């Protein structure tokens, strides 16, 4: 006999701990939640030069996992009657009325099907006026709704519009409404001075300390959130148990679980990627392939609406890596946070190995 917490720690040691030496990663946090029990595993240093250990207070950058909070905020505003996903952005950002982008609906912005939005804002797009000009000069390429092209400006505009519909800045939408509704205590769009001692350095591919800095304000819905391992386990708990939360945030969480279309084996939900469960490892790897992440792909309507499903999301910044995954009917999920990027495939593979080996 070996206690469960030790069995899970041994599986994380076997599958995630070797990644630290393999990719010269300073620090890592891995959390598993199973049947509402949380297991937290911390490795390495949040700051190499300060010899400061990663711990339950360490704040990491979530990168594109930030989009899951934007999606939740959108689900919240929709089920509060503040927006319809059939609305267009010019209904809320009036300067976009009578522009081509005002033909694209909010759901299409949130799920990357406008037809002509690239992965990033151009480097020169920094001010609010440059963002306005960027979207005013947008013209459709592909037929709207036909093609998925993963796009930070696309979901950034969605987040800006959600915020406008709630009459507050997006940072306030998350920090004053969504994070508290989810019970998160150390999640931020802007880390306060009192928490800077807990904000890990990111480390670039030369193991030099860095931190996210760039992009316009309206990129924050795409990659601007920072959080801790306990907070991300609470967020997974909320996604596994939405019925335990008040009606408004319950409905918001459920909105993010609804698949909207497919590209091959991947269901695009709001923020989350969704898959039939059990999913093959290759299905999960394909979601992060160059073909899916970097190129436009024709979308198809959902045919099989999976009763039994799983969800995941990767995220990265220059100096950080994130992976979150959960499986509702196995009552289980996992979060990985690192302060150095490692290949997405390694994150997915390690999590797959751990989750499949944990005893039910």
Residue numbers in the entry: 1 to 360
Can you list sentences taken from the study reporting this PDB entry?
One of the most important mechanisms is the production of β-lactamase enzymes capable of hydrolyzing β-lactam antibiotics. Herein, we describe the activity of CR167 against other β-lactamases in A. baumannii: the cefepime-hydrolysing class C extended-spectrum β-lactamase (ESAC) ADC-33 and the carbapenem-hydrolyzing OXA-24/40 (class D). The nucleophilic attack of the catalytic serine on the boron atom forms a tetrahedral adduct, which mimics the acylation (or deacylation) tetrahedral structure of the high-energy intermediate formed during β-lactam hydrolysis. The structures of OXA-24/40 and ADC-33 in complex with CR167 and select chiral analogues were obtained.
The X-ray crystal structures of ADC-33 and OXA-24/40 in complex with compounds (S)-6d and (R)-6e were determined to resolutions between 1.47 and 1.55 Å. ADC-33 crystallized as a dimer and OXA-24/40 as a monomer in the asymmetric unit. In all three ADC complexes, the inhibitor adopts a relatively similar conformation, extending into the R1 binding site. The sulfonamide forms hydrogen bonds with Asn152 and Gln120, mimicking those formed with the C7 amide group of the cephalosporins. Additionally, the terminal aryl ring is involved in π–π stacking interactions with Tyr221. In the S configuration of 6d, there is a clash between the ethyl substituent and the oxygen of Ser64 (2.9 Å), as well as close contact with Leu119 (3.3 Å). For ADC-33, a class C β-lactamase, the (R) configuration in 6e of the chiral center alpha to the boron atom is preferred over the (S) configuration of 6d, as the ethyl chain in (S)-6d clashes with Ser64 and Leu119. The smaller methyl substituent would not result in these clashes with the enzyme. When compounds (S)-6d and (R)-6e, which differ only in the configuration of the stereogenic center, were compared in ADC-33, (R)-6e (Ki = 3.7 μM) was found to be more potent than (S)-6d (Ki = 22 μM). The structures of all three compounds extend in the R1 region of the enzyme and no additional interactions are displayed by the hydrophobic chain introduced on the carbon α to the boron.
